[PDB]
Design a protein around this ligand. Structure first.
Ligand code: DAO
Length: 162
């Protein structure tokens, strides 16, 4: 459980973290790009919609990330073939960037999200520092396009996992 060694954002405020986030980069050893996040607090949990543009078509996945008893740490419960996904919001100023850690089957990944583009050099460099600290190399970092985003899918391309 590599993610247990990660410190969550001190006094994480779901209300301030709400809204739209754009994926900037991902650090992962895991063996179709571009992504948008819509986060809406739901009591103690977080209602989350992710959008990805594939072959010009927008696909939406609706999920619920439950509260785990620790601020900044959430859980996407397993269901069927989908394994559980642990999430920790680490560094974030709510107004420009967010560094999230995800773990599935013991494999840790790191994602950098931004409120708008481009992200500052200091944040990008900071993210890269965290990736190397997560024992991942520069070649395990995938930087996403500064275009190709979408944030609305029709009823035929919505996967509701809630
Ligand atoms: C506050 C909860 C935030 C949850 C962020 C989830 C980010 C997208 C994770 C996508 C995982 C995957 O499908 O590989």
């Amino acid at each position: 459980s590599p993610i247990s060694t990660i410190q969550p954002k001190a006094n994480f405020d779901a209300q301030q973290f709400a809204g739209t986030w754009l994926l900037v980069a991902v650090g992962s050893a895991a063996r179709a790009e571009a992504t948008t996040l819509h986060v809406a607090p739901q009591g103690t949990a977080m209602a989350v919609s992710t959008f990805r543009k594939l072959d010009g078509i927008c696909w939406q996945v609706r999920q619920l990330y439950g509260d785990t008893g620790v601020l900044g740490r959430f859980l996407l419960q397993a269901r069927g073939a989908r394994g559980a996904v642990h999430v920790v919001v680490a560094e974030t100023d709510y107004q420009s960037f967010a560094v999230l850690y995800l773990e599935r089957a013991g494999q840790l990944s790191v994602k950098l999200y931004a409120r708008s583009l481009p992200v500052s050099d200091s944040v990008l460099s900071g993210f890269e520092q965290r990736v190397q600290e997560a024992h991942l190399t520069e070649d395990q970092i995938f930087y996403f396009p500064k275009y190709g985003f979408c944030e609305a899918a029709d009823q035929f391309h919505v996967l509701d996992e809630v």
